[PDB]
Amino acid sequence: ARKGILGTKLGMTQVFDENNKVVPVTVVKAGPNVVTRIRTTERDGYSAVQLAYGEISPRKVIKPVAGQFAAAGVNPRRHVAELRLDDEAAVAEYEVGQELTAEIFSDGAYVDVTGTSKGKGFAGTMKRHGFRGQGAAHGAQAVHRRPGSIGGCATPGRVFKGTRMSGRMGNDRVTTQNLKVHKVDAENGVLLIKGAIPGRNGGLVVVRSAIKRG
Amino acid sequence: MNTLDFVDQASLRDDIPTFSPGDTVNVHVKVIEGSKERIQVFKGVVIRRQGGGISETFTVRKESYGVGVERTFPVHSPNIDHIDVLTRGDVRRAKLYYLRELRGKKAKIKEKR
Amino acid sequence: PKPTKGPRLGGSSSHQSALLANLATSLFEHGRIKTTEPKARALRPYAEKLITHAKKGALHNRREVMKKIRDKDVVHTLFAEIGPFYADRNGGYTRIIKVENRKGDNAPMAVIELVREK
Amino acid sequence: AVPKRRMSRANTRSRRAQWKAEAPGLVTVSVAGQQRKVPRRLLKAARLGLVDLD
Amino acid sequence: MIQQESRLKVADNTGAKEILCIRVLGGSSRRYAGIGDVIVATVKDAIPGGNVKRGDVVKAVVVRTVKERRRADGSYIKFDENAAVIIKNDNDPRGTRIFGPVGRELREKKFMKIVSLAPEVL
RNA sequence: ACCUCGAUGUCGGCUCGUCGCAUCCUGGGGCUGGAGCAGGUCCCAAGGGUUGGGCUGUUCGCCCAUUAAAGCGGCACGCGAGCUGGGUUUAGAACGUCGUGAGACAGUUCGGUCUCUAUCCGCCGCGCGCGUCAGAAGCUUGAGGAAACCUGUCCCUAGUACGAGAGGACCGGGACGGACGAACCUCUGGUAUACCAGUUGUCCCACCAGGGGCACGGCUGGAUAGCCACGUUCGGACAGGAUAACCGCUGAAAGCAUCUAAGCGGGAAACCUCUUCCAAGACCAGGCUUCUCACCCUCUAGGAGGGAUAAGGCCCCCCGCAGACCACGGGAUUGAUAGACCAGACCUGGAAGCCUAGUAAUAGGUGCAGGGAACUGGCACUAACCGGCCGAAAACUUAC
RNA sequence: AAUUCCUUGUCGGGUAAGUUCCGACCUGCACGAAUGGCGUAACGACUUCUCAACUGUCUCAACCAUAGACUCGGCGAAAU
RNA sequence: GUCAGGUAGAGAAUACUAAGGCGUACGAGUGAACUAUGGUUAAGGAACUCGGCAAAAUGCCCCCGUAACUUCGGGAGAAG
């Protein structure tokens, strides 16, 4: 079944292969998770496992949230997320209260990493959509970065939905597929993933076994 | 102090000599051709050292057959075996990019005495 | 300290440098000044780094302070009075207190003070 | 670009209703024995006598 | 990092001195030629005695670039000049001698004869 | 000559696109005067792709290098309240030509003001309100949308099939690329207006020394964080379903024959799934849970009106790599949220003072020195407060 | 040809590629001798073509500062 | 129209500054897009475009050294 774990992006560094090739890696704190809830086709209509991650003072947890952790018999955690599972045999592999660690993965496995991309604020069309903008000279009047035309004429006499324009950019859910796990550090609880993963350092990510190359 | 020091410490190499920009060095580089593996020496002047930890790099400049060549290495690269320092230089700055424009006698660096 | 993220106080980097220096001088001379809240918040770290040089006390530290404070009388006060007074306190030499907005432009105003308690 | 038509009474008022002040939240402070109301932002200054309670 | 209209010194004894890059080969819209990439070029300057005269259209392979090139090991190579060797359709030089050092990349790109004749390969 | 002359601005280029298929490439096929390679022609197919230069105001066209290919058209010959203004088509001037002349020329030549603070619809983003039959909170299903969809070369199979030879495969495997998109900052590279160093002119701090102000940050050499591309990593599947052209099986009407009339099958980058993202204002306003589940007063005993609360929330406060505002995320003394402070990392490159050498400019020692932001870890010294405002249930029918 | 409609005439030069440019040919639609003809050193913010140097003009765009834009307080228009 | 301080400098240019005079009448905030005005830029270097438009570049003093052509003055600060 499709393994997965919640974690925190720690930062990027560099390691060397055994054939001396350089490998850029992002370090993911694949911290211990606890199974807080199991979704079943008979209760919920679908199969999934609910995971909890990150330390939290019980002073900070709101009472209805504490009630759900109490019903599960586990200490509250900051972040709760579901991993969707295809079938009930996969659900059977999990039990409430059970702890998951980085060691669910092995070196050379392919993972998909999901995170929130960095915020870019209100972005122009050149930055947000890669518009070419206009000439810096040859008479061009105050349109160096302007988007140009946004439609035809009397027909259709309107701007189509989906027309690319300026606006808020970033802070989106992004999944990067088929990243190689270079190393698993069981002692530090860390994944070294080759390549980039979405998000700022310290941000929540979800590491799952790759659908396409799993 | 770095967040990822506990990862990088595993790859840090211990046989690195101390050297500074302006020193003449001999960098023994592993090179593969076919199946045989040999060592090729790159002799020149260290013109810069930037970064830190396992990502620190240094750049060596040589004049070869009338053509300037610069070679940049990860300090802790396992593709290097020996770095041998030959002369200490007298320089007044961390980055020796001005050497890129100089030739011959004027490109020479003063030695430590 | 951490540079201003947005546009500088005074409408230029050079005016901001002069403004911070003048505000520090005033703060040390009187012990308490009232200004706009952004200026007060910008002054706090700048003034505290100067007080640190004063606590160190050496000739080197004095010259460093003089790079920003041109009032020699205030420099004397920093090294003979304010410095010694804070010898045992590790950071936190100033306090910011929010006060009433200014009438003519509704500018938020703050008082910044040297801490006297200990 | 100029307005094409006059704006209906209703449309004007709907937009114009968004131009309004919001009341400051006020807290009580005892000064000179009397209890006055001041913004929570000014609570510390009012006890220190830095606020002109007219 | 060579492109159309970039001029390169000639690194062999064919008799050309400068070539002008006309097209980087190896795909539609391909922007940049690096070490080991084949270009089409015109001869802009020639030695009076040369076998190849000014205005001839020739094929050449880039052997030196000013823009630093990354290697698998995380190392970099950089030269003070851009230089190309005039090639024929069998990847052999048209000249008999190669001047100056060449990049390792030529070996990966199968220009063995050029690697052989180069005074140094770096 | 039907709308517009109380105004609907033109060619070409630029920017941004969107649609058709009469298809340029890639995909699937029938027939060939198809041996093979490579084609000819016709059928099906619009998912994606469809280069950069020389000449000309040009469109067009010719040419030079490439490419899998450098498609044809519609949208006021798309797009000037988005840009340009070279051509044309105001006023100046000149040539040829015509005119007695004033002048004229789908003849030519040089020059010649491109205005507007967006009300409405529309589009890209972001809030506030109310609703989803008590008030709240965590995690969710996915009706329905959006995005993505390109392709080469070389090496095996194989110098095999085919072929006199020359030449040279289908199908099936593997490696390495071009273009494009996304995320990201370890590396490379760019930037740096409170970082460090050098240095010119001048004024100042009485003066020397050491510094500061101004001259683009005066200039020059570097430069962590942030942002970023020239950088790094990853992507386009794999499989299934229903089909197009086409190939059929089994078969009558019509003793034969026929893919079709009853029935049963193969079959493509198009379609539906599959991959990524949005998504219950999806008014059929969903689901699985958890928390609060409580009280006073007035009208009349109907329904309401008001006040105080619970869970929770908001505002104020300390902030953020979150940000136009707002929102969002975190912290709020039972506290490391920000600053300071201490230490490290990193950047700069050897401070001042003193001593020594030199006539001096200057050099050396003290000393990986001194200075310093963003990154990391400690540390309640400073500020996060002796607090305000919101916020919980008419009933009734049938089934069990 | 500041004159040539046909016309991007034809040949030569320059460029990888030149409807422009330079040198020629004469088939001058429709040159020509004080509405002067043909030249000419010097001169030109004239017009035209080529080269070196140089560069964000461009490949291809990134980052910084300031003035607006944006937020808060005050005053407070306009075309339509 | 009349006075013309000082240090650099050929100078009444320009930079800083003395005497003297001002801060001149909306402000306070804030790293949005976008526009304006300045700044820097890897590799390439006119490929931009009607056209090198706009930028960049050259720039001072003292020596050396300067072609075609010419109306004999020039060209000429040629160029380097």
Ligand SMILES: [Mg+2]
């Ligand atoms: Mg304008």
Ligand SMILES: [Mg+2]
């Ligand atoms: Mg402009």
Ligand SMILES: [Mg+2]
């Ligand atoms: Mg260093």
Ligand SMILES: [Mg+2]
């Ligand atoms: Mg900044």
Ligand SMILES: [Mg+2]
């Ligand atoms: Mg301002």
Ligand SMILES: [Mg+2]
């Ligand atoms: Mg300045």
Ligand SMILES: [Mg+2]
């Ligand atoms: Mg009629």
Ligand SMILES: [Mg+2]
């Ligand atoms: Mg009208």
Ligand SMILES: [Mg+2]
């Ligand atoms: Mg068709």
Ligand SMILES: [Mg+2]
């Ligand atoms: Mg499709």
Ligand SMILES: [Mg+2]
């Ligand atoms: Mg049109």
Ligand SMILES: [Mg+2]
């Ligand atoms: Mg229009």
Ligand SMILES: [Mg+2]
């Ligand atoms: Mg006229």
Ligand SMILES: [Mg+2]
């Ligand atoms: Mg006449």
Ligand SMILES: [Mg+2]
């Ligand atoms: Mg003009």
Ligand SMILES: [Mg+2]
């Ligand atoms: Mg004209």
